[PDB]
Amino acid sequence: SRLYKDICSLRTLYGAWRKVRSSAFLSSSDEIRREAEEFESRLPDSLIEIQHALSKQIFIFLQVLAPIPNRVVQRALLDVLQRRVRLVKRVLGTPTSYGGRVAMAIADAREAMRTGARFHIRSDIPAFFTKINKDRVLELLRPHLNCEATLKLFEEAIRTDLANIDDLRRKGLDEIFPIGIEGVAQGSPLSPLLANIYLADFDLAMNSNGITCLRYIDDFLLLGASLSDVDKAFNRALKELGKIGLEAYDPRTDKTKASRGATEIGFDFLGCNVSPGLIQPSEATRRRFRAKLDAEFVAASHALRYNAQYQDGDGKYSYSSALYRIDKIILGWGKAFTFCNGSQCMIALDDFISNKLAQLEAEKIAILANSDSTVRRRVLGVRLLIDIQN
Amino acid sequence: MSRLYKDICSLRTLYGAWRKVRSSAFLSSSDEIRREAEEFESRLPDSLIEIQHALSKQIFIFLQPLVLAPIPNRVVQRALLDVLQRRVRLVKRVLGTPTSYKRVAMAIADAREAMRTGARFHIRSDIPAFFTKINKDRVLELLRPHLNCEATLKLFEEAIRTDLANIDDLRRKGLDEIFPIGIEGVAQGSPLSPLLANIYLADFDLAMNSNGITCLRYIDDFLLLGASLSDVDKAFNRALKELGKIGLEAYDPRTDKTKASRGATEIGFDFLGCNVSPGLIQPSEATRRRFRAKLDAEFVAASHALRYNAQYQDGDGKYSYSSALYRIDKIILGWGKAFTFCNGSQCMIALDDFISNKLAQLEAEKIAILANSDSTVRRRVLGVRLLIDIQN
Numbered sequence A: 001s002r003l004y005k006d007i008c009s010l011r012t013l014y015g016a017w018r019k020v021r022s023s024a025f026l027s028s029s030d031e032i033r034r035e036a037e038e039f040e041s042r043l044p045d046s047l048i049e050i051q052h053a054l055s056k057q058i059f060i061f062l063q064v065l066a067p068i069p070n071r072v073v074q075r076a077l078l079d080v081l082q083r084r085v086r087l088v089k090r091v092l093g094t095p096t097s098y099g100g101r102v103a104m105a106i107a108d109a110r111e112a113m114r115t116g117a118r119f120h121i122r123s124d125i126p127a128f129f130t131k132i133n134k135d136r137v138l139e140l141l142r143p144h145l146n147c148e149a150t151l152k153l154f155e156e157a158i159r160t161d162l163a164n165i166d167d168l169r170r171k172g173l174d175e176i177f178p179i180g181i182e183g184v185a186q187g188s189p190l191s192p193l194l195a196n197i198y199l200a201d202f203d204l205a206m207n208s209n210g211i212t213c214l215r216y217i218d219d220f221l222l223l224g225a226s227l228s229d230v231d232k233a234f235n236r237a238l239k240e241l242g243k244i245g246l247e248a249y250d251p252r253t254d255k256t257k258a259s260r261g262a263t264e265i266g267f268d269f270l271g272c273n274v275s276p277g278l279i280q281p282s283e284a285t286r287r288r289f290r291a292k293l294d295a296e297f298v299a300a301s302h303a304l305r306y307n308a309q310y311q312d313g314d315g316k317y318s319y320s321s322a323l324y325r326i327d328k329i330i331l332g333w334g335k336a337f338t339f340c341n342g343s344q345c346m347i348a349l350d351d352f353i354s355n356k357l358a359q360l361e362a363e364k365i366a367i368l369a370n371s372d373s374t375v376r377r378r379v380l381g382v383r384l385l386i387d388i389q390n
Numbered sequence B: 001m002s003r004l005y006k007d008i009c010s011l012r013t014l015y016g017a018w019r020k021v022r023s024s025a026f027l028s029s030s031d032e033i034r035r036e037a038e039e040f041e042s043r044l045p046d047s048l049i050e051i052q053h054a055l056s057k058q059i060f061i062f063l064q065p066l067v068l069a070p071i072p073n074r075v076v077q078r079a080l081l082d083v084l085q086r087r088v089r090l091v092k093r094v095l096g097t098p099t100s101y102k103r104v105a106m107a108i109a110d111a112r113e114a115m116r117t118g119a120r121f122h123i124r125s126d127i128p129a130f131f132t133k134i135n136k137d138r139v140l141e142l143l144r145p146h147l148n149c150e151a152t153l154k155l156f157e158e159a160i161r162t163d164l165a166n167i168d169d170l171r172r173k174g175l176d177e178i179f180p181i182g183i184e185g186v187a188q189g190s191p192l193s194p195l196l197a198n199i200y201l202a203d204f205d206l207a208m209n210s211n212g213i214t215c216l217r218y219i220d221d222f223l224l225l226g227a228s229l230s231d232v233d234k235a236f237n238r239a240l241k242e243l244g245k246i247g248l249e250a251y252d253p254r255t256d257k258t259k260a261s262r263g264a265t266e267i268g269f270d271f272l273g274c275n276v277s278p279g280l281i282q283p284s285e286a287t288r289r290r291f292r293a294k295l296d297a298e299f300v301a302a303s304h305a306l307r308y309n310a311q312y313q314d315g316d317g318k319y320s321y322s323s324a325l326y327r328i329d330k331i332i333l334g335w336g337k338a339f340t341f342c343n344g345s346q347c348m349i350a351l352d353d354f355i356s357n358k359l360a361q362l363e364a365e366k367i368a369i370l371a372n373s374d375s376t377v378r379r380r381v382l383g384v385r386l387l388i389d390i391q392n
Helices: A002-008 A011-027 A030-041 A044-054 A068-086 A087-092 A102-114 A134-145 A149-160 A167-173 A180-187 A191-198 A200-206 A227-242 A283-309 A317-335 A343-368 A372-381 A385-390 B004-008 B013-028 B031-041 B043-054 B071-085 B091-093 B104-116 B136-147 B151-162 B169-176 B182-187 B194-199 B202-208 B228-247 B287-310 B321-337 B347-368 B375-382 B387-391
Strands: A121-123 A212-216 A219-224 A258-260 A268-269 A272-274 A277-282 B121-126 B214-218 B221-226 B261-264 B269-271 B275-276 B281-283
Touching: A002 A011, A002 A044, A002 A068, A002 A149, A002 A372, A011 A068, A011 A180, A011 B043, A030 A044, A030 A068, A044 A068, A044 B013, A068 A087, A068 A149, A068 A191, A087 A134, A102 A212, A102 A219, A102 A268, A102 A272, A121 A227, A121 A268, A134 A149, A134 A191, A167 A180, A167 A317, A180 A191, A191 A200, A200 A212, A200 A227, A200 B221, A219 A227, A219 A277, A227 A258, A258 A268, A277 A283, A277 A343, A283 A317, A283 A343, A283 A372, A317 A343, A317 A372, A317 B321, A317 B387, A343 A372, A343 B387, A372 B347, A385 B321, A385 B347, B004 B013, B004 B043, B004 B071, B013 B071, B031 B043, B031 B071, B043 B071, B043 B214, B071 B091, B071 B151, B071 B194, B071 B347, B091 B194, B104 B221, B104 B269, B104 B275, B121 B228, B121 B269, B136 B151, B136 B194, B136 B269, B136 B321, B169 B182, B182 B194, B194 B202, B202 B214, B202 B228, B214 B269, B221 B228, B228 B261, B261 B269, B281 B287, B287 B321, B287 B347, B287 B375, B321 B347, B321 B375, B347 B375
Parallel strands: none
Antiparallel strands: A121 A219, A121 A258, A212 A219, A268 A272, A272 A277, B121 B221, B121 B261, B214 B221, B269 B275, B275 B281
């Protein structure tokens, strides 16, 4: 079919590889950034192998993140469907569905609270990607595709990757992306579309009767004028989720899995603490960031003593390299939260960074005092020409 | 369309061509050359397809302060080289010439073997204005029977007219500022230049390697090795007669002391950026002087950035204390890796002492600047961004 030939064309496949590349570089993990580089090292034959297998309708190549051949096929399947299929173009353009962004949902949440949304319930659909009915998804997609090859490809994308997105795998994504939920949408490009197809009825039913429901994949936020309205909304949501064999964490019985109460006091949403007036990274996100920085400064502190005594020190953690990589870690994290207006927590984080940097600077000075020139070279991270020749 | 020209236009050979062009850009120290390759990489799908498409249409306008050839021109030249050397008998033959270079380290290795077997004297010269005085029609004349494909032949001619024939003495001096061994820059900036030189000087290579005279040539730099000063003088005059046959010449060391060398091999001589002596191979004095000047430039930029980042809040960050020590470290890595075939340890130690000394000056200047400074100045000076500046 024209639909399947569009997925097999190297134009859309190569076009999908760039999106997979960006989603990887937006992550802190070096292994994910280097995995894209090796696939890139075979760029001509590596994507033609995918194209050839799709033409033969052989999907065995799909077997914390999905493999790049799997990740590219998912991205290539999405772009074609959203510009060729009316339903896919429709569910991805849902006003209350975000993912195909976090800043938009939080901006909409903030706007609602500024305009009467004084109470909220924020919950999650537990075990969403494992409890969703694979056969209902294919059922809802079959007439809109009219291509059993594309349907089987979508079916194999779910079986190999999407249905395996469990809570253990999601926790691995949180330590990789600054806003953890953005990892699912980018390690599995079909997950936003998969959730939008399965919860399209849920979205339509929940945005009514003065209740706003903002949803990002399987995380949703109910906003209302009174506590009674959001309480009625949550029970209405449990029934809608129950129609398709799903549930949601009750904030009244699972205090740590869901939130409930006034919006004026603030609540966590998509990795940020959202008040009607203040938007900042959540306490859990900042704790994760301070722990990431501590590990780099600890590694830099050990390398000061190692490079002063030994000549096989890894330059990656030398003084120049460590300060260089910590700078990039700060750049990547701050850029992910440029939509936030909380200046106090950023300055508090800056004081934490400057404090540990002062500890490292003072430690370097004490070690390099009365040291010889070659020791200063290994500690600061500037190679000796004689070592390269030896 | 012939199978030879379809091979050049295939994206597979165009991809292996650009991967080498990308690699050669990183082997250069110039940040502009490394970032120019990234801009062509920013359009990776359509950038190489535009070339593939225009080649199939035989439209070569895309080949048109720039020291290297443009990346589309550089890619096509590399693709033309890869296809020719594995398909044409002459091209694989002239590239596999024993006395033609097989990197610089092999030419220097062959020079040591000649000295090891009796070459007590030498003459090292250059063919001046080689690429501008090269005859376009003689090149096509030597290639036309071995190709049998006018499409590939006209593409070779347009590569010469747009890039190779414009490699003049002013542009070569720009290549020395970029690569540790300056003559390697010609091969990296214009991939077809070694093949073009080997095709043009094939008769010269055959005539010179005779009568007990070893002739080692790298593009347009050549070295004559013989048992006596009389032998290499006879050989140099034989080289002038051969170069005069094709409207070329070579610098006479007897009249141009600074353009060519002549004398005993035991006292040492400069060849391909290296000083070659009986047992000591090391970077030449000009190569070491050019390297110290590059390090001086980075430390000057690092020194000025300490003063700038301490006074102003729009610092580049590229030359901050951590970033400067980082790039200088890599500059030292790239320069040292290029002379791993050398065995002269005293000059590597002398350069290390030079590096350690400039590093001590910079560390002392940073200490005086950061003394009695606040935390925000130390952040800009050391090269650790502020989270509050990103959010603003």
